[PDB]
Design a protein around this ligand. Sequence first.
Ligand SMILES: OC[C@H]1O[C@H](O[C@H]2[C@H](O)[C@@H](O)[C@@H](O)O[C@@H]2CO)[C@H](O)[C@@H](O)[C@@H]1O
Length: 380
Amino acid sequence: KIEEGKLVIWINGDKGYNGLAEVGKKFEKDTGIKVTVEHPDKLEEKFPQVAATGDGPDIIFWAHDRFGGYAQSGLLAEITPDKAFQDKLYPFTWDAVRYNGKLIAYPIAVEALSLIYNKDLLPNPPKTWEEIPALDKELKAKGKSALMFNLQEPYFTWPLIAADGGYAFKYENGKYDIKDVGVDNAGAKAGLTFLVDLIKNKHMNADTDYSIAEAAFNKGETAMTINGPWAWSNIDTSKVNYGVTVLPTFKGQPSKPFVGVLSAGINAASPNKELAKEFLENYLLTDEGLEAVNKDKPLGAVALKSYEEELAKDPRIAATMENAQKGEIMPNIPQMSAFWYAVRTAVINAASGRQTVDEALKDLKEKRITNTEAAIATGK
Ligand SMILES: OC[C@H]1O[C@H](O[C@H]2[C@H](O)[C@@H](O)[C@@H](O)O[C@@H]2CO)[C@H](O)[C@@H](O)[C@@H]1O
C-alpha cells in the first residue's frame, strides 16, 4: 500500500538521484510533503511486479521504451498536461511518450550514446570502426587498450548493429510492424560480425560490462569508451582530459544509436496523483529543478525548451544531439521488453563463441523474440 501525503520516486542508479532529492527537499519546503528518492536495482523489472500487486513508488523514471508495456499492464495513471505546459517541451519528446493517442508520462531528457575519448592518449580519435583494430595494436605496445565499452547490455552494441541496415521493428504506416523484424537482415549480421571479429582478435573482451569499462576509461587505461551523458560526471572527477564526439562509422554509414527519452510516469495506484503532477510540472520541469539534477549527473539534451537553450552551448551536448539525429527514437511499444531480452541473449552468445553470428540472430528472429513476446504476455 502506498502512503497518501508522500512521494516515493524511483530512478536508475546511473542517473542523478541526489540532485532529484534536492528538488525533493525544495518541494518539501514549499508544500510539506516528504519526497523519498530511491534507486533500486533491476528497476524496470521490479516496477511491474511490485506495482501490479501493492504498490511500488508514486513516480517512476525510465527511458520511454518501457512505458507502453506499463500502460498496457494498467500501471500508469494517464497524465493531464494542458497545451500551455506541452509547448514548454519539444514536440518530438511528447511523441516518444504517446501511446494509442494518449500521453502516459512526462518527458525529461534526450539520451544518446556518444564516443568519449582520452585526448592525452588519443588526440585525434578514429572516425571509423574499421580504424580501431590498428589503433589497439598501437596502444597495446604502450600498455593500454583502444576501446572498452559495455558488451552485456544491447543498448551499447546496437549503434553498430543498426549502422548498416539493422533495425528492431519496421516503421511502417505507422505504427510499428511487430511481424517485420530487422534483426537477421544483412546490416545486422554485418554489424555483429564486425563486433565478434574485434573479440576474436583480442581487441575487446566478451564479458566487459558497465563497471569494468568505466573503471578502465576513468583510470586512464583506455583511449575510448561509449557511454551516455550520465557518465560525464565521473569522468570529470577522474580528471581525465576527455572529449565527446560522433560515433564511428561502419562501411561509411553512421552508427545509429537507439535514442531514449528519460521519462516520468505516475503509478496508477498512487493516491498522490496531484502531488506528483505538481512535483513534475512545477518543481522538476523548471530551469531550476533540471539544474539540480543535471549538476549531479547530466541528463543530456533536456526536454524543457528554456533550459535546453543554455545546455546546447555545451559541445558535449551538441555531440549527443549529433549522435541522436543519426539514430532513431526507440519504439515505446510493449514488445520492446521481449525484444531487449532476446537480443541480449543473442549478442552475449555470439560474443562468447557459444554460437556464430548467423546462428545467434537466426534463432532470435525465427523463435526467441516471439517466444519471449508470448512469455511476457502470458504472466511468466
Ligand atoms: O540494454 C537494454 C536496455 O537499453 C536501454 O537501457 C539504457 C537506458 O536507456 C539508459 O538510460 C541507461 O539507463 O542505460 C541503459 C542500458 O543498460 C533501454 O532503455 C532499456 O529498456 C533496455 O533494458
